């Protein structure tokens, strides 16, 4: 099963910034402006965080910010809280009329 | 092949015997759905040069779908009815909620199938075009790229063949407001009409008849607009069911029979009023005063029985012997002396009276026939053109055998002037009663003196 | 050999109701085609018992009652009478074999 | 509205011959005509169809071109030709005049009296 | 209120083709679209399938297509997946999710994750 | 897909009656209902107001009634509050939120805080 | 401004249970089945957590459980995660045709 | 007051002069909106005993709102038209989207106001009932408790007065399918209609006229159903605008004038055919052959001018002098000798001929008058009942002055038998031309002999 | 369709008197009648209304019961009585016959020739 | 004293267009009541210039053009002619003062 490359785990102390990312091809997360990022807690539901590359939905903090460049999409955060210890996903419309998820990225604090 | 007719000269008229009937008597409806995607805005940054035509193509397509969203001598004895009867009923059934979803669901991959509605109607379905697959695999993966740019423009033309048809739809339903006669090929192509015939619940000889004459059944067929919701835009054809096929049926032309009296304006005359088509459906005959509802193509007539007469089979007896005590034999009498001529399938009947030059001419030997007085008849393979009054006409030129039987001046069978000319419908019995009662009145007036 | 199939082994004493059932494929009957039932008494010529599954000809009793549904047609006779020893048919317009006759059921009293 | 016909007999198969229908219908042009045959053992089957001008000939799939049908309107009669023959052709043949349904169908109404044609030996 | 709840799941033999049923209440049903995703213990999310309003354009992942099918109901408002040829790897939690607001069928318009349910654990064992 | 943003807010003089404007897209607007709440730094949430579909039954808190008015627009899809006689205590963040699914006007059916936005800080100073 | 009584702060170590509550009168959170509980994070949006007493919405863990007794509504949690460090609210339909919120309850771990 | 009439005996007829007209000529429309809450299920655990009645009350209310959701002798010269013209137009305007929201918004607290629609129509609005406040403050804070229990049952009856009206609505619009004549008080009460009278743009004397005769304008008023969406269920009242008021206008009764010939069946007679109401609107007169469209109440008539005649003011000249060369003076002639009698406002006209016992009797002195032959006239304050043929009738008993003028047998002004009895409409000019041409024909027949 | 009237003169206020309208309309019963007055200085104002049977009398709010109106249909004439009087009653008085509008209105069509009534001293 | 108010100080030379405007309260005019304009030349009796704001009587020129809107009525005269020295009125049906006459504007040529 092909997926999207992501870092396995990223570490950041609270009150910092992390610029996590996922990389694909042109027939992937690259272009097509269907960058999607999702948070999930263990044993609970996922939740919408980032869609349409940079635009934020309901029920999410303003400190989230999404972007993309070349064939790599990215999410940037500002001033962490302990409640963001979670795992993150990126999702896109691939060119072969299908959706494609990421490998998951763990994010924690000390 | 063997077209024939016999001009009676006793009453001046031609009976174009020998044809095959192929009359309709029923309506067959079917739903045709054209699927289509509710396209959003293109989400394109910049205009570019290669990708321009797709933009106004989809925009005009949106305009079309939104505007069609916003869309929702014996004729006096003849009847009138609603031709749009069953198709509007089927569309009205489709107005009910949750019904068209079944047509959407069952007709998912197979091109044609059968569904049943909430009234037990289970005729047929068809999906005519496949915009789901082409839109969602060949248009938007290209159109919805970031800062959009097509791979090439030469891939658009096939989409044109998937779009222009829709456009046709547009300007033929915004002007007709639901009903279109005749049915265009853009609702239903020729090969697919052949497919619908092979899917009709009809016999194989009628299938062969339809396959030979696709254009005529295309001409006479109807189309009625159904609902537009849940992107399954659809319409019902009410293509005619054909009840009876292949019975001999004739076009009766009638012509004036008026005496060439020296005193002008004192020439009463009775002329037959029986124009039109007659043929024996079951043991009775169907009469068509409307020659326009009936169409002819290679000895095959095609006509609509809604505006017909189910008259008894005794109409040939009055045709041969006009004075028979079994039929009303409707005849129109007047003092008019009108030089009039008609063209049958294989000849011309001239009936010119008074001061009127009457010539029948060929292009080979110049003029060849001259009509002095009385109704006269010429076979089509004797002449080419006819000059009468101040007008020329051209006779039909199909090969067939035509005969002129010798008749008699029936207008001289009656009194020289008792006939009134103040009616528009009469029969030989009514006129004979009028003659008898006027004779009784004048002999009573003479007796009282 | 016929697409019309009906069991030619139906018999009963006079007085009761007897049903005759004939079935075909999809192309005949189920493609919107009617079924006609006749009689085949030996000697005198066969003649129609019921046509187009609902309407009956001029001289027949009301005992015969036809019906059709899907790909199957039926004829019910209530109150059997003795001279009904005959052989009964079905008739449709299969797209292959043009006018197809059923094998017929031999009905006799007991 | 009755019918009469002739042409039956015992003929060795293989050679062509002539079967006649002589329906006494005084208005024998509007009603569709069929010929069928009833054989001992198996059931009856339909053989041939004709109507009006005779420009919509059709035959049973057992006989493609083997039986050749024609009718003459003015003489009010009809002919079938046994171009090809075989062992199962022995049957009582019916000239059957059918009426037209509301859709298109032949009800196969009032029938002929039947003529046995035997092809054994 | 918006919610989804789940049924089915648990211990399944290898093979043993299964129908999984979702449920929903408290909002509009026929208008929007629902779809199915999974994630396994130790692995991330991976897409399974999407349907639109009514039964139309049943989309599937490239590594799943043919094995699992999806069909929805507008009478009792329940999502029906049915999977076949169950391998060892399918031990995972399955999530109902929802997307699409207007009546659209193009998959790019149907990529939105507005809400989620709780899913169900399905395990294969012997 | 549910989305809100805000406009206005910031430093306001005492008094200086203010109109606050919300914004919404990506979903149907005319159907459901919207409402306004606040919370101050150091204090919890306290209810302000609710409107239903169209301009009907403008609901207000008992400690706020008369000082605040609310009106919504179905042409450009914006919530419009307008407050008057601004005291010192109103320094708070104001949140748009949404509730109600069917066409209901009764206040009890309108109690669902199904989604939220980001609000706006409004401060009073001299 | 009248409100609903609540504990100011509740302390629980991770992987435990807390049974936080709010109390009013009958013309309040008492009865009327409009018990509402909401989570909120600092400087971000609130979020729907508990409504219709025991019904759970989308995007919330199954370990949440709401109930009520007499004139006191309660929320019970199971097996804490660090991401629940937040503040909680209860909301109800008061009898005087209005919504009434609570005083807020802080919840943390060590 | 001063009711009068003059029975002409030259032509046997009564002209009930002196009344005030108050004719309508226009339509005034207004929207009446009843607001209502889209109530959900009660959310009740258990059935209880005190709270039962509210449950079926609200259930029947839901049934009503859902079913009404699912709801969407000179008459031959008289014309026909669509009475439901302006109200259906206003409802059709309200079918447009975003229009009724303005009525919803502007009419929020004030009971009556003015809005303008997208066609500039700006007549009036009114809200008849206030279900929002009562439902949301007096019904659901009680009904939506845990294991629901009302405080008391005696608080429900006022809600009954807020609900039963709706129920009336129900069974008067499920049977009439949109249009109800007359308008019930349940759409619009008496005091509320009195308030409405002070609202439409009419003059104050017409307001006094409406206030005195609320029941009659209630009788003539219409009601047409508008849309039901966004819980603003509404309907248009089409209370008539009243064009002209207070002109004198008369009921012309006509009676047979037939000779008592000894030979029965040979008694030709011409009798006036002018039944109905006549009054001078502007400089012309409005004629009403329909006495049923016209209603009388205390010398105040109320009638509909749509089925009227705008005939010239010269109709009194033919009324007084029947033989005048200025009017057609339509008279019906026949040989029928029918003992017929009519009752005017202040008397009875008997016209019994042949063998028919004709008596006029009181309850005080027994029988008091006997009619032998000819048309005879009796004042209402001379008799109480009349027996003629085999039937009794009761004369009106309103106080007024009535006079009988002595006339003449106009039937003897013509020939004893030339009059045909084979027509249903004729005038004195047409009949006089017939007499002249028949006289010319018979003198020509005598001259030719 | 013209009108004539009389009754003007110089009278001390306080006492009742009689003003006449003698319209020459040969069909003076269908058309509504009003009386108005035009005074020097300020504008004209409407005074009194009558129609048909005279059962819908109305007066201007300046004179409640002060002016008493009547008409006789058969004599085709009309009367107004000065029950109460005062200083501003001096004006040229108009007997004005108005037609009926499509709704109900008086257009105040063809007028009288006016009679001056003076109440000064 | 009249509810009808119009400025009695309008004058102009012959040749041009002159507008006369009269306004009232809500109860007159704006409550769906028409306005009638007359003339008041001294000597000969006053007579109607325009009735119900659109239709004109038999003998009048086409110079007069009436209009109404809201609570205001207007009369425009294009191409003034010399004998138009008159005093012009308005007439409505106020619910208080029954038939109300305007004060009138004195129009004279220059």
Question: How are the SSEs placed, and which strands pair?
Answer:
The complex is a heterodecamer, with two copies of chain A (110 residues), two copies of chain B (449 residues), two copies of chain C (110 residues), two copies of chain D (121 residues) and two copies of chain E (126 residues).
Chain A: E1 9-11, E2 19-23, E3 36-40, E4 46-50, E5 65-69, E6 72-76, E7 86-94, E8 98-100, E9 105-108
Parallel strand pairs in A: 1-9
Antiparallel strand pairs in A: 2-6, 3-4, 3-7, 5-6, 7-8, 7-9
Chain D: E1 5-6, E2 9-10, E3 18-21, E4 32-38, E5 45-50, E6 58-59, E7 67-72, E8 77-82, E9 91-98, E10 115-118
Parallel strand pairs in D: 2-10
Antiparallel strand pairs in D: 1-3, 3-8, 4-5, 4-9, 5-6, 7-8, 9-10
Chain E: E1 3-6, E2 10-12, E3 18-25, E4 33-39, E5 45-50, E6 59-60, E7 68-72, E8 79-83, E9 92-99, E10 120-124
Parallel strand pairs in E: 2-10
Antiparallel strand pairs in E: 1-3, 3-8, 4-5, 4-9, 5-6, 7-8, 9-10
PDB class: viral protein
Keywords: RSV, Fusion Protein, Antibody, viral protein
Assembly: decameric
Describe the structure.
The complex is a heterodecamer, with two copies of chain A (110 residues), two copies of chain B (449 residues), two copies of chain C (110 residues), two copies of chain D (121 residues) and two copies of chain E (126 residues). With 110 residues, chain A is mainly β. Chain A has a single domain, classed as Immunoglobulin-like (Sandwich), CATH 2.60.40. Chain A is built from no helices and nine strands. In chain A, strands 1, 3, 4, 7, 8 and 9 form a six-stranded mixed β-sheet that branches. Chain B has 449 residues and is of the alpha+beta class. Chain B contains eleven helices and 25 strands. A seven-stranded mixed β-sheet of chain B has the order 16-13-12-10-2-1-25, with no helix packed on it. By secondary structure, chain D is mainly beta. Chain D has a single domain, classed as Immunoglobulins (Immunoglobulin-like, Sandwich). Helix content of chain D is 0%, strand content 39%. Chain D is built from no helices and ten strands. Chain D has a six-stranded mixed β-sheet, with no helix packed on it. In chain D, strand 7 and strand 8 form a beta hairpin. Chain E has one domain: Immunoglobulin-like. Classes of the chains: A mainly beta (110), B alpha+beta (449), C mainly beta (110), D mainly beta (121), E mainly beta (126). Chains B and D meet through helix 8 of B and loops of D. The PDB classes it as viral protein. The entry lists the keywords RSV, Antibody, viral protein. The assembly is decameric. The entry is titled "Cryo-EM structure of RSV pre-F dimer in complex with CNR2056/CNR2047".
Question: Top keywords for this entry?
Answer:
heterodecamer; A: 110 residues; mainly beta; Immunoglobulin-like; 3-stranded antiparallel beta sheet; 0% helix; 40% strand; globular; B: 449 residues; alpha+beta; 2 domains; 7-stranded mixed beta sheet; viral protein; RSV; Fusion Protein; Antibody; decameric
């Amino acid at each position: 099963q092909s997926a999207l490359t992501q870092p396995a785990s990223v570490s950041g102390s609270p009150g910092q910034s992390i610029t996590l990312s996922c990389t694909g091809t042109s027939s992937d997360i690259g272009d097509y402006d269907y960058v999607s990022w999702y948070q999930k807690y263990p044993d609970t539901a996922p939740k919408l965080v980032i869609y349409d590359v940079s635009e934020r939905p309901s029920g999410v903090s303003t400190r989230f910010s999404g972007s993309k460049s070349g064939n790599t999409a990215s999410l940037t955060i500002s001033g962490l809280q302990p409640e963001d210890e979670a795992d993150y996903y990126c999702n896109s419309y691939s060119s072969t009329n299908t959706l494609k998820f990421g490998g998951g990225t763990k994010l924690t604090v000390l | 092949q063997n077209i024939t007719e016999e001009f009676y000269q006793s009453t001046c008229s031609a009976v174009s015997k020998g044809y095959l009937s192929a009359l309709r008597t029923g309506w067959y409806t079917s739903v045709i759905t054209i699927e289509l995607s509710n396209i959003k805005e293109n989400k394109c940054n910049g205009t570019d040069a290669k990708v321009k035509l797709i933009k106004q193509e989809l925009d005009k397509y949106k305009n079309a779908v939104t505007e069609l969203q916003l869309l929702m001598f014996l004729g006096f004895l003849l009847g009138v009815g609603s031709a749009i009867a069953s198709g509007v009923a089927v569309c009205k059934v489709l107005h009910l909620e949750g019904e068209v979803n079944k047509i959407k669901s069952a007709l998912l991959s197979t091109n044609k199938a059968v569904v049943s509605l909430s009234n037990g109607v289970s005729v047929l379905t068809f999906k005519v075009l496949d915009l789901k697959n082409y839109i969602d695999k060949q248009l938007l993966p290209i159109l919805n790229k970031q800062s959009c740019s097509i791979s090439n423009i030469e891939t658009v033309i096939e989409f044109q063949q998937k779009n222009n048809r829709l456009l046709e739809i547009t300007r033929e339903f915004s002007v007709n407001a639901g009903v279109t006669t005749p049915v265009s090929t853009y609702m239903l192509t020729n090969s697919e009409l052949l497919s619908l015939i092979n899917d009709m619940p009809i016999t194989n000889d009628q299938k062969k008849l339809m396959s030979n004459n696709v254009q005529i059944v295309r001409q006479q067929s109807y189309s009625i607009m159904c609902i537009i919701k849940e992107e399954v835009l659809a319409y019902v054809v009410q293509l005619p069911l054909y009840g009876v096929i292949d019975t001999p049926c004739w076009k009766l032309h009638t012509s004036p029979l008026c005496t060439t009296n020296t005193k002008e304006g004192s020439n009463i005359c009775l002329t037959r009023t029986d124009r039109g088509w007659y043929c024996d459906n079951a043991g009775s005959v169907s009469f068509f005063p409307q020659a326009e509802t009936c169409k002819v193509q290679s000895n095959r007539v095609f006509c609509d029985t809604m505006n017909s007469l189910t008259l008894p089979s005794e109409v040939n007896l009055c045709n041969v012997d006009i004075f028979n005590p079994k039929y009303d034999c409707k005849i129109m009498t007047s003092k008019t002396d009108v030089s009039s001529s008609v063209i049958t399938s294989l000849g011309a009947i001239v009936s010119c009276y008074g001061k009127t030059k009457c010539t029948a001419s060929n292009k080979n030997r110049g003029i060849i026939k001259t009509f002095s007085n009385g109704c006269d008849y010429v076979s089509n393979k004797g002449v080419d053109t006819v000059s009468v009054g101040n007008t020329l006409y051209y006779v039909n030129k199909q090969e067939g055998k035509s005969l002129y039987v010798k008749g008699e001046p029936i207008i001289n069978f009656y009194d020289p002037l008792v006939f009134p000319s103040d009616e528009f419908d009469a029969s030989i019995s009514q006129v004979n009663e009028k003659i008898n009662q006027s004779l009784a009145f004048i002999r009573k007036s003479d007796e009282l003196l | 050999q016929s697409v019309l199939t009906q069991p030619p082994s139906v018999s009963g004493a006079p007085g009761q109701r007897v049903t005759i059932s004939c079935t075909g494929s999809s192309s005949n009957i189920g493609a919107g085609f009617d079924v006609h039932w006749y009689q085949h008494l030996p000697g005198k010529a066969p003649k129609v018992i019921i046509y187009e599954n609902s309407h009956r000809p001029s001289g027949v009793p009301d005992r015969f009652f036809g019906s059709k549904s899907g790909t199957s047609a039926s004829l019910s006779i209530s109150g059997l009478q003795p001279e009904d020893e005959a052989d009964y048919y079905c008739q449709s317009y299969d797209r292959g074999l043009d006018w197809v006759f059923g094998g017929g059921t031999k009905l006799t009293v007991l | 509205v009755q019918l009469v016909e002739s042409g039956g007999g015992l003929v060795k198969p293989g050679e062509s011959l002539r079967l006649s229908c002589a329906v006494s219908g005084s208005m024998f042009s509007s009603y569709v005509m069929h010929w069928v045959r009833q054989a001992p053992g198996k059931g009856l089957d339909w053989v041939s169809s004709i109507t009006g001008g005779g420009n919509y000939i059709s035959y049973a799939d057992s006989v493609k071109g083997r039986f050749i049908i024609s009718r003459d309107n003015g003489r009010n009669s009809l002919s079938l030709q046994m171009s090809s023959l075989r062992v199962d052709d022995t049957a009582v043949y019916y000239c059957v005049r059918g009426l037209s349904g509301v859709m298109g169908v032949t009800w196969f109404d009032s029938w002929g009296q039947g003529t046995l044609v035997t092809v054994s030996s | 209120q918006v919610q989804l709840v789940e049924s089915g799941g648990g211990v399944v033999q290898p093979g043993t083709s299964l129908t999984l049923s979702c449920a929903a209440s408290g909002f509009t049903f026929r208008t929007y679209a629902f779809h199915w995703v999974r994630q396994a213990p130790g692995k991330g999310l991976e897409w399974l399938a999407l349907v639109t309003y009514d039964g139309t354009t049943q989309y599937y992942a490239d590594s799943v297509k043919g094995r699992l099918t999806i069909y929805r109901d507008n009478s009792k408002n329940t999502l029906f997946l049915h999977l076949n040829s169950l391998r060892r790897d399918d031990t995972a939690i399955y999530f109902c999710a929802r997307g699409g607001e207007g009546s659209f069928s193009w998959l790019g318009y149907l990529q939105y994750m507005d809400v989620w349910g709780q899913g169900t654990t399905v395990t294969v064992s012997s």
